[PDB]
Amino acid sequence: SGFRKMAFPSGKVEGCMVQVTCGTTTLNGLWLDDTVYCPRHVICTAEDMLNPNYEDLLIRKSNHSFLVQAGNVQLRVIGHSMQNCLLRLKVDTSNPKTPKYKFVRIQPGQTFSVLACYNGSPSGVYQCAMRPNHTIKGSFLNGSCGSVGFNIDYDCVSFCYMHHMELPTGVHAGTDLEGKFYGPFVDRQTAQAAGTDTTITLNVLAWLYAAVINGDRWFLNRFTTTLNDFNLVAMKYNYEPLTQDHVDILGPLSAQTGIAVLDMCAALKELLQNGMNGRTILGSTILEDEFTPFDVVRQCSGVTFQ
Amino acid sequence: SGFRKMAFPSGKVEGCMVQVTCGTTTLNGLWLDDTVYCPRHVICTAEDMLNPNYEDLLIRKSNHSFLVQAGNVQLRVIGHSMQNCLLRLKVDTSNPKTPKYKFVRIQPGQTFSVLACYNGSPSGVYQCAMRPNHTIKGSFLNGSCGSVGFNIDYDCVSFCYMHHMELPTGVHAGTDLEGKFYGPFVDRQTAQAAGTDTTITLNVLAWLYAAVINGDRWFLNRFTTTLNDFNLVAMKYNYEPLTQDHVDILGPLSAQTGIAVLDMCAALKELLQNGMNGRTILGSTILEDEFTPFDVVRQCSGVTFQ
Ligand SMILES: *[C@H](O)[C@H](Cc1ccccc1)NC(=O)[C@H](Cc1ccccc1)NC(=O)/C=C/c1ccccc1
Ligand SMILES: *[C@H](O)[C@H](Cc1ccccc1)NC(=O)[C@H](Cc1ccccc1)NC(=O)/C=C/c1ccccc1
């Protein structure tokens, strides 16, 4: 029993982390086979950031402009390209520790583990959700750029995030492993800000199912709601509209607990309207929205505590 | 910026995890050099648990009663001993992946990362604190016994916990890597329950310092308190008594923020008495107590956002 924000074991990823220095800038890179991935902003100076032309900055660089360190060993760069907001540095060695991997672009609402790293050495791991406004609530200091987000299936690592910057609200922005930013953000010093965020409705509902699987039913009620009547309440509390697709995804949890989704929706409507009254749900006083339906199934028992 | 419950990278530990089967019971073990550590209750049947004599159960076993699997490979047992509530199984191979390690008994209030594992394969990692009542609020299902808790310093793994059982309240109990239980608990089916718990005062205070380093001062006040006047309030809200040792440990955070500890104590007294008033502290509506002073220093900036 119990319910914790749980990250994937980080070992397959720790063996891919390297250090990347270009001039006086140090950050992290990801070394798979014979390539090292890293934020392109590694090439920039301070003043460069107000106005960088990356094509123009990169043409002025040779292979040997880049020092890549894997643990104590230096890896020699023998090739480079730019792909969107990333550099792809080809090196003399294939990583002996490259795992089975894939690159994926994850969707808002989905979660991933972040391996926070400094100077190519992993310091910590935690679980994040991609917010609706395309930021993550990470924990990052200067030096963390190039740290990566991931999910693991069987023994394949699905890389989904590389960290590039902190916004003024203290939340974090970056790209997929194709160098394409999540969100409207750009790797230049401008007045960009996180857009207004929304609560992830699907995740909240999943988490109420988790609470029921774990043995708590207090928050249920006799009522039901239509999809449409729920959403009018949802909009008022700054929750995402629930869609039929979302209802269908919640099928298996629904089945395991014998609580119809629209009945769970009615319970939620009542929680939003009345509060929790000094009560907790899985040890929380607020409604949690960083656990997907997938996460609940991975973690919780296949057998409900009726 | 930001503040997350952060676990240590788990790679050095993932390479130590094995599977241990004795009859129809499967669990996890820890393989360092030429030894595999695991809960002694692996030898028990269902009925055994009402009344086990472990010395008597173990004498009836040969080396080859035990199957240990490391990934796909079987490791042959060539020796065994019992140490307190653990078995120590000597095997034919030294683990090529044994890291620099130590065994430590941690103290209530301190935190550690848990690598949750099933059938010798790591499934997730999260951060736990040892509660004052000597349990952890873990997330564990059947098959997780033998999963281990740890801290990492430099490249040394300090192993501190092995999981043995779930109590009726859904919290988790186990031992150090000497097989000695944390808490008054025993590996037999009796009516044992978690004792009443306490809020970890030292950690709460550390976490208020974290909030200040990160840029939030709302909860501070003009007041000060004596150690003694604080504790009378503490006892009333079921918080641990603050001691001078605790005051001294909070020195560096105090210095970095320029808030005297007893001034922080006064702020806390005021939070306990008045509540937070629908406000949050580092994204939390409740006062968090699972981050030590050490954890705050590891994670937070060395420079305050004044
Ligand atoms: C990379 O290592 C570093 C990561 C970082 C820095 C500070 C806090 C948390 C993480 N980030 C950067 O080098 C980027 C550079 C950049 C600048 C503009 C656009 C794209 C990239 N710099 C930052 O992320 C700093 C932003 C910031 C810091 C403090 C307060 C407000 C904003
Ligand atoms: C080990 O793999 C397994 C871990 C577990 C089991 C259920 C839920 C979470 C974790 N635990 C056990 O085999 C122990 C055996 C044991 C029994 C008595 C004393 C010492 C050890 N069994 C449990 O932990 C189950 C306790 C329990 C389960 C459900 C509801 C209440 C109590």
Whichever domain contains A242, its CATH number is 1.10.1840.10
| d(CA B66, nearest CA chain A) in Å | 27
DSSP A253-293: HHHHHT--HHHHHHHHHHHHHH--TT--BTTBSS---S--H
Q: Token pair for residue A94?
A: 């294939």
- For residue A270, how far is the Cα from the chain centroid? 30
Helix (H) or strand (E) holding A163: strand A156-166
The reply to whether A118 falls in a domain is yes
Burial of B60 (0-12, 13-18, 19+ CB in 10 A): exposed
- The widest CA-to-CA distance across chain B, in whole angstroms, is 69
Q: How many beta-carbon pairs under 8 angstroms link A with B? A: 110
Residue A170's domain comprises: 1-14+100-197
The amino acid at residue A122 is P
Q: How much distance in Å is there from the Cα of B59 to the middle of ligand 2?
A: 24
Name, in order, each residue with C-beta under 8 angstroms of B188's C-beta and a sequence gap of 6 or more: B49, B50, B51, B52
A99 and A157 Cβ atoms separated by less than 8 Å: yes
Which residue(s) pair with A166 in the sheet? A172
A271-302: b or e for each residue (b if 16 or more CB lie within 10 Å)? bbeeeeeeeebbeeeebbbbbbbebbbebbee
Q: Sign of the CA dihedral A42, A44, A50, A56?
A: negative
Query: What are the phi and psi torsion angles at A36 (to 5°)?
Result: -120, 125
Which residue(s) pair with B102 in the sheet? B158
Same domain, A178 and A190: yes
The reply to whether A306 falls in a domain is no
Beta strands in chain B (DSSP E): 17-22, 25-32, 35-39, 67-70, 73-75, 77-83, 86-91, 101-103, 111-118, 121-129, 148-153, 156-166, 172-175
Q: Which of B16, B38, B85, B145 is catalytic?
A: B145
Total number of domains constituting chain A: 3
Output the CA angle B139-B142-B144, nearest 5 degrees. 60
What is the Cα–Cα distance from B85 to B150, expressed in whole angstroms? 18
Query: Looking at the CA of B145, which ligand is closest?
Result: 2
Instruction: Choose among B148, B157, B151: nearest CA to B176.
Output: B148
What is the Cα–Cα distance from B183 to B173, expressed in whole angstroms? 8
Instruction: Choose among A84, A102, A82, A88: nearest CA to A34.
Output: A88
Whether residue A126 and residue B285 make contact (CB cut-off 8 A), yes or no, is no
Give, to the nearest 10 degrees, the angle between helix A201-214 and helix A261-274: 100
Contacts of B2 in chain A (CB under 8 A): 137-140, 170-172
From B99, B128, B151, the end of a domain falls on: B99
Residue in chain B nearest A144 by alpha carbon: B1
Same domain, A288 and A235: yes
CATH number, domain of B10, equals 2.40.10.10
What is the Cα–Cα distance from A16 to A176, expressed in whole angstroms? 16
Same domain, B162 and B278: no
Same domain, A31 and A66: yes
